[PDB]
Design a protein around this motif. Structure first.
Motif, PDB file in Angstrom:
ATOM      1  N   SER A   3      -5.182   2.490  -2.257  1.00  0.00           N
ATOM      2  CA  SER A   3      -3.738   2.302  -2.474  1.00  0.00           C
ATOM      3  C   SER A   3      -2.901   2.737  -1.262  1.00  0.00           C
ATOM      4  O   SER A   3      -3.332   3.580  -0.455  1.00  0.00           O
ATOM      5  CB  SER A   3      -3.299   3.043  -3.737  1.00  0.00           C
ATOM      6  N   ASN A  11      -6.240   3.607  -6.119  1.00  0.00           N
ATOM      7  CA  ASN A  11      -6.593   4.993  -5.757  1.00  0.00           C
ATOM      8  C   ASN A  11      -6.807   5.178  -4.245  1.00  0.00           C
ATOM      9  O   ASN A  11      -5.823   5.101  -3.500  1.00  0.00           O
ATOM     10  CB  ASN A  11      -7.687   5.546  -6.670  1.00  0.00           C
ATOM     11  N   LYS A  30      -6.089  -2.514  -4.864  1.00  0.00           N
ATOM     12  CA  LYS A  30      -5.464  -1.342  -4.229  1.00  0.00           C
ATOM     13  C   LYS A  30      -5.480  -0.105  -5.077  1.00  0.00           C
ATOM     14  O   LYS A  30      -4.482   0.610  -5.146  1.00  0.00           O
ATOM     15  CB  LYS A  30      -4.013  -1.643  -3.806  1.00  0.00           C
TER      16      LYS A  30
END
Ligand SMILES: Cc1cn([C@H]2C[C@H](OP(=O)(O)O)[C@@H](COP(=O)(O)O)O2)c(=O)[nH]c1=O
Ligand SMILES: [Ca+2]
Length: 129
Positions: A129, A126, A124
């Motif tokens: 995310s 950047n 997850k």
């Protein structure tokens, strides 16, 4: 495929860099990836990442794929390496780019970059995310 030497002129954005290649300027666009615009989330972070990677390298190399070497805007299309590390792959692995623009006959490193993307996604990181 083969890696050819080039000299950094200036970083431009997350997936575009200006290089001196065989004595002439080339605006190189990274094959197989898409970084966010500077006005999108993770855009500044993608530009910063690529700038630091190319500006800190001792040795930049250009590797064309098997198909077209120039896009319809006049940019070179290549895989770029910075002290042996591929910028295209690094961006993807950091979740700062997605695998994109995969055209037949210029997709040598597709599987490699999709492995990277899978890890970035699992973590997850950047964009993911
Ligand atoms: C990476 C890549 C981009 N491009 C073109 C496609 C997009 O223009 P079109 O939308 O007009 O077809 C554009 C996206 O570049 P950027 O992501 O740098 O803005 O660059 C290629 O033609 N071949 C490529 O391999
Ligand atoms: Ca882009």
């Amino acid at each position: 495929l083969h890696k050819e030497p080039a000299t950094l002129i200036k970083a431009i954005d997350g997936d575009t860099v200006k290089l001196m290649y065989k004595g002439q300027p080339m605006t190189a666009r990274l094959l197989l990836v898409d970084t966010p615009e500077f006005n999108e989330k993770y855009g500044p972070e993608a530009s910063a990442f690529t700038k630091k990677m190319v500006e800190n390298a001792k040795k930049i190399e250009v590797e064309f794929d098997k198909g077209q070497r120039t896009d319809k805007y006049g940019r070179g299309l290549a895989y770029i390496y910075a002290d042996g590390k591929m910028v295209n792959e690094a961006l993807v692995r950091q979740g700062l780019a997605k695998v994109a623009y995969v055209y037949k006959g210029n997709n040598t490193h597709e599987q490699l970059l999709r492995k990277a993307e899978a890890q970035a996604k699992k973590e997850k990181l950047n964009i993911w995310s």
